[PDB]
Amino acid sequence: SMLWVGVVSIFPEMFRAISDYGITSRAVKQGLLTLTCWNPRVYTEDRHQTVDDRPFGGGPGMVMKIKPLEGALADARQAAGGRKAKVIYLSPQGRQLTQAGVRELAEEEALILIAGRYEGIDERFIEEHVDEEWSIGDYVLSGGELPAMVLVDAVTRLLPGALGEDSFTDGLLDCPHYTRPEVYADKRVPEVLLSGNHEHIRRWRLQQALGRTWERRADLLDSRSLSGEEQKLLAEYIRQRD
Amino acid sequence: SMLWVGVVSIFPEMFRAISDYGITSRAVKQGLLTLTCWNPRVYTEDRHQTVDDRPFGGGPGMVMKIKPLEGALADARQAAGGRKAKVIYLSPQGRQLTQAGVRELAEEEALILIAGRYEGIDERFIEEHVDEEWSIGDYVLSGGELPAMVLVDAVTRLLPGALGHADSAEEDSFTDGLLDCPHYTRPEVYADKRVPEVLLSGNHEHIRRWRLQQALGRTWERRADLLDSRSLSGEEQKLLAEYIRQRD
């Protein structure tokens, strides 16, 4: 009800990974998320339910047939009802998904996600019916199923009351985490977390985040508008390190 | 056999998405891929102890204990045999996954992936047992299961004979620092849009030049950042300069 998601995929059973597990499964139960699949294989003319077709110009692999995708997409737009649905094609050619992109995506009421397969889908189908293209990263997968689930998972986290700051909220990585025992195999939990002083635990965590962000991902800080307080904790972290 | 994968996750049965469907399922059946799961909840002190416990220092959430993770890792290591195993924690604080990262990981004999849940895993588990932290992108997911699946699918595509006649790893996006070209299939005309004439009647050299130009132009248009890293030849410069001028 909060967000309606329709997935066009030839492996709808893969979506059990999000329908049966975690925040996405909980969001469905809580009525915040509606999840549906539209299998191009159901929209075929032949006895073996063929969705691929050879490519023009030669080259290796196969390409997805326009008609079976169009078939599955038409029914999905119909099932969206009167919701303003954004048609996304999962692709390595798309806008790289980042937390800022996830927030944008979380404002939508309806999403139709097209999961490609093989060498990909016909460019004319993209030109005709695809509102936007999104990539989950600079690597190549065998289908759009895992990317579509990554996108759904990330967005659902921002759905009010689904969870029950993050690693990319305010261009800063996350702090380390400690739990029982107090000491495990001669390795002990930092004293600052054993003390009970909220301001001291916040100060340390915020420094440890700034510290890891500068160590591993200095690029996330160039974009960042670091405060006078954050500029002191990062400086302290840098100079007090071997 | 070619690659052995062990996943450490509180949701082992979530991995049916890769073990039962697509290329990863075919690779498992063809003997190219071994895929095993290892629930940390089976290695706790006693049945009354959960995988998680309260976080030291307060704050919202729970944190995965070290002993259950240590137990599943130890058992997963034993099962790998005499294969040299690389131990990966999926984390957004890790090394950003890229096609080149995928090529490196494809050369590994064994991988043990650690999918974390909750708020995070205890920092002392990482310090003592993790060989590398890998991120799938600059966004936060609820668990490491989808990132672990993304990694296995990407790597499996590069195993000899895993793609068949469906696709080719030699011709992808990011392999040579460029995005892929558009793809076209039957019919020659659809929605008052005709397949580019070069694909319908051109020779191999014309098709190659059009495919390279498209890959360059699409890279220039959507991902200019990729061109900053990867230099262009005289031919590529001329194919690109011409793409740019003929855009509309």
Ligand SMILES: Nc1ncnc2c1ncn2[C@@H]1O[C@H](C[C@@H](N)CC[C@H](N)C(=O)O)[C@@H](O)[C@H]1O
């Ligand atoms: N990194 C990714 N980001 C979003 N979707 C992806 C990504 N990798 C693969 N896909 C999906 O997987 C499908 C099949 C891919 N093997 C085709 C990729 C295409 N030949 C290319 O190199 O760009 C694509 O049609 C996409 O739907």
Ligand SMILES: Nc1ncnc2c1ncn2[C@@H]1O[C@H](C[C@@H](N)CC[C@H](N)C(=O)O)[C@@H](O)[C@H]1O
């Ligand atoms: N972008 C990602 N790339 C690789 N793994 C991820 C990514 N996002 C989340 N994870 C996994 O999801 C697990 C736990 C999540 N609740 C992440 C929230 C956690 N507080 C954090 O900011 O890292 C992490 O331990 C990782 O295993």
